[PDB]
Design a protein around this nucleic acid. Structure first.
Lengths: 229, 302, 236, 300
DNA sequence: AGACAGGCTGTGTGAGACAGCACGTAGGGCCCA
DNA sequence: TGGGCCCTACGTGCTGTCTCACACAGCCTGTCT
């Protein structure tokens, strides 16, 4: 039954391809007629590679927004256009094959790959976020906090958020932090009062969820995004 | 008498079929010596693929063009909703090992790792059209360049970038799969542990940002990534664990005395050949910018 | 290399057989193996396979005639599972040993029946083997109208389900905290599947405020990722 | 000297081959098979046999035939140390072709991770495994070069003696190649909404199949069993065929009915892309607590 | 302690069995009468 | 209402390939002088 099945498999393999070709050509007929009409279509289309260089470049610039430079016309639709690169990257360009740097478009990054013959192409590739430890000591603060609470990031590092909170809510904040650590990655939203530099109390929401290692699932820190409403 | 007459009539058609197929085999834009040895099924497959590609191209409206294939560091694929490589650039053998006439027309769900079928199906289905994902493709090319039998071929990871085309509806996806260079067979280099702590850093790290490598060993890097790239790098690390070779996007790495630097990570896992399990994770990082906004402190370590 | 991997496999097999023999040269190790073989055509006997079947699944063997439904013979393995003895099964039928609702179901008959505990019965024609509130759940749509409440909400908030369906949680929420619930719902909508927790006040059947903390995450479609509803776990 | 060394090599192979020849005789195998076995196969069979004997020592025949599956044994390392002889009925691979081989050699590459998690050591197990099948729909055998995949519902308990897992693998019948009064058939679209139903649905719960088309099924599921059903439906998408555990699915006028579903994805012979999902929902129990209402749909 | 015979290991060669491709042969409908 | 033409499924022949063991040359070890 091994050989018979293969012949059945091959015939169905051939039969399906017979059907597919007939649908492919606009111009059901018999098999011999199908192949003869296909040969006629090929003879019409024969005027040794599957695609031409123009078609290949069309496919390349449709798949990836790239241009050829040693320049091609496709620079304008994408870039809107040593001197053309970043002043700090001139040393990297001189020694340079594959390199990623910034070129003139306000700077944009350009990914270039090629070989030395140099021929290469260029293909285009109210809330603040802060980090706390398992107990809430500030580990990282983003620039967006200066417009949120007014405190500079330096003055917030090393001090627990609970001390920055109202004394009445300190028990609820501790309970929420324990909950966040226990849930293992489920975000928790808590409404509380955040003191500003001017000591003015602002209503704040906290979205704190534990961050685990992708492999070992070890608690690295808690990501805390805060929105003022 | 009815039995013998049919055999002569039946043998007549087969003789006519072979010349028709030979004519069709010769009509394919291939060398003459290749079309002669090509069996019927391969002729059918290549003809269907060529006709589909021609139909797609005709619906879309000088010596510099020929340089694209060798300059571009990948090989162009075209995939339809069916999953057929209706066109592959002739330089597929240089990067992937397999030869164009063997691959063209075959199912893309066959010549890739079986665990990337779901990702392929999700990316092929169809509002942004950009696609960027990692696909494990079967490789018959050995590290020394010797072509080796497909029945024992090993998997290779490719970074796929392309668009979905809806051409008058029939949909094709045009992929440019690029190889990930292994760091042992080739900006600073590094090396990390399997659960991602630092285990080695190149001495070039000192000049770029002021970090001293001896301080970095033993400390997890997740405290050094900017908070705005945590989920992106987590997805990339999940790709690392699932496949083995991945490439990051543009993310921020914190400096020593202030600011951050934009780096790109081309990280590959290395397996111990004695026992066939992951041992260490090797990363190669591309620094592309200096320290930005050094005047402010962002982290406790800074 | 193919030949190399064979000898590597062969040497590993040689090493493997070295440990397992109760009591060197390859020829002598094979001689010891075959001597043990002489001291020691199926790999298992009937009883060994029966023991493996019993260990693999907490199941039992029973046979009932199809002509009348009377019980003919049952195995001793029914007692550890169904907590019933063989004597009661002997001399009886299968109809009275099953749920009354499934009496007609088995008449037509691989079928599923409850004896209650569900028993997954498989066999061929008859030989067969029988094989074995402080919080309430709720649903919401995108806008937050109650689409489903389990009967546990009676024990939690005191309301019967009919008095919560059709009324949005925000309307049911306190006017002071109306904005927070809307913010939380928008948050879970745009998070796309991340479990989120919010504490608020819930008005019970007797119109007094009480603390309530919920866990909401949008049900995305496994295929089209369309939001089906929101599941909330209200813990009191 | 060298010729004597050459003769010694031939002499040592003579005793090497003679022990292999007689070793296969002692194994409880057919003589037409035992004499034809190579060294690797006989060594694997002997190792596996000895492992089964060590495991065991540390109306009866109807137990195997009654089951619609084959008993399967795995070690902590994945050795297929024992398979019941009725494996050829389902996968077509004979027992001698399977015994001793690593389970990771006869499993889809995406089920290796689930295998590792389930083998690692509650002791109960229940998982779906894509094991290689060499049977066509007509019962013909076929070599490994074109074997297809089949999903097996694996249930068993890990035991600690050396620790091994005893499994019973069962096939999921294809609804197109098979329905009493208490069981009905239905078909859904890719996005898991009702697209067709059997005429037996109305007497079970009161549903009219006319307005069911176009509505998602997830509304009708009970809220408690949403996560378990979501996991099982994701397994259906990944592997192809699942048998969902008992869940509650709401009726029209109230209550709930326990329903077990054996979903089955259908692929076209032309595109190899998913087309529709066929579910043979087994209704085991009638409506419980009819007077209670649960969802907005039940209100209408 | 160094040399000799014996045991253990790495690489190339030969053959029975099997998978692929293609053709001769007979079994069903096709539209006609 | 009259059997011919033609389309399609199956066994067989030939060829290339797969996997197994056989044999030889080299490395490591016990033993004798």
């Amino acid at each position: 039954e091994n050989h018979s099945e293969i012949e059945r498999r091959r015939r169905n393999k051939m039969t399906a391809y017979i059907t597919e070709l007939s649908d492919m050509v606009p111009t059901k007929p018999d098999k011999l007629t199908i192949l003869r009409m296909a040969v006629s279509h090929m003879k019409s289309l024969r005027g040794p590679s599957f695609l031409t260089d123009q078609e290949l470049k069309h496919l390349i610039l449709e798949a990836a927004d790239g241009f050829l430079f040693i320049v091609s016309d496709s620079v304008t639709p994408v870039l809107n256009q040593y001197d053309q690169v970043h002043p700090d990257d001139v040393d990297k360009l001189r020694e340079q094959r594959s390199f990623i740097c910034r070129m003139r478009c306000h700077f944009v990054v350009v990914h270039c790959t090629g070989y030395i013959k140099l021929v290469a192409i260029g293909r285009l590739q109210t809330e603040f976020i802060s980090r706390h430890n398992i107990e809430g000591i500030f580990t990282f603060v983003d620039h967006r906090c200066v417009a949120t609470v007014g405190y500079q990031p330096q003055e917030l590092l090393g001090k627990n958020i609970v001390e920055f909170c109202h004394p009445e809510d300190q028990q609820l904040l501790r309970d929420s932090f324990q909950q966040v650590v226990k849930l293992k990655g489920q975000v928790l939203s808590v409404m509380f009062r955040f003191r500003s530099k001017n000591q003015e109390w602002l209503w704040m929401r906290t979205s704190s969820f534990t961050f685990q290692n992708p492999y070992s699932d070890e608690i690295e820190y808690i990501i805390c995004t805060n929105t003022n409403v | 008498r009815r039995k013998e007459k049919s055999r002569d009539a039946a043998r007549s058609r087969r003789s006519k079929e072979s010349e028709v197929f030979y004519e069709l085999a010769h009509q394919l834009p291939l060398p003459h010596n290749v079309s002669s040895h090509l069996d019927k099924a391969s002729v059918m497959r290549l003809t269907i693929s060529y006709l589909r590609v021609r139909k797609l191209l005709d619906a879309g409206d000088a010596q510099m063009n020929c340089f694209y294939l060798k300059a571009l560091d990948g090989f162009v694929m075209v995939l339809t909703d069916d999953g057929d490589m209706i066109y592959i650039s002739d330089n597929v053998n240089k990067y992937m090992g397999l030869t164009q006439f063997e691959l063209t027309g075959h199912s893309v769900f066959d010549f890739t790792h079986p665990c990337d079928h779901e990702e392929m199906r999700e990316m092929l289905t169809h509002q942004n059209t950009q696609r960027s994902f990692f696909l494990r493709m079967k490789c018959t090319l050995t590290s020394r360049g010797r072509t080796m039998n497909i029945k024992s071929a090993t998997w290779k990871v490719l970074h796929c970038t392309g668009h979905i085309h809806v051409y008058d509806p029939m949909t094709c996806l045009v992929l440019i799969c690029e190889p990930i260079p292994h760091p042992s067979n080739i900006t600073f280099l590094s090396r990390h542990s399997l659960d991602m702590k630092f285990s080695y850093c190149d001495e070039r790290i000192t000049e770029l940002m002021g970090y001293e490598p001896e301080e970095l060993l033993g400390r997890s890097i997740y405290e050094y990534y900017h908070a705005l790239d945590s989920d992106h790098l987590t997805k990339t690390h999940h790709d690392m664990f699932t496949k083995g070779q991945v490439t990051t996007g543009q993310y921020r790495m914190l400096a020593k005395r202030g600011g951050y630097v934009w780096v790109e990570t081309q990280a590959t896992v290395i397996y111990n050949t004695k026992n066939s399990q992951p041992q260490c994770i090797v990363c190669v990082n591309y620094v592309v910018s200096g320290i930005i906004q050094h005047d402010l402190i962002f982290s406790l370590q800074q």
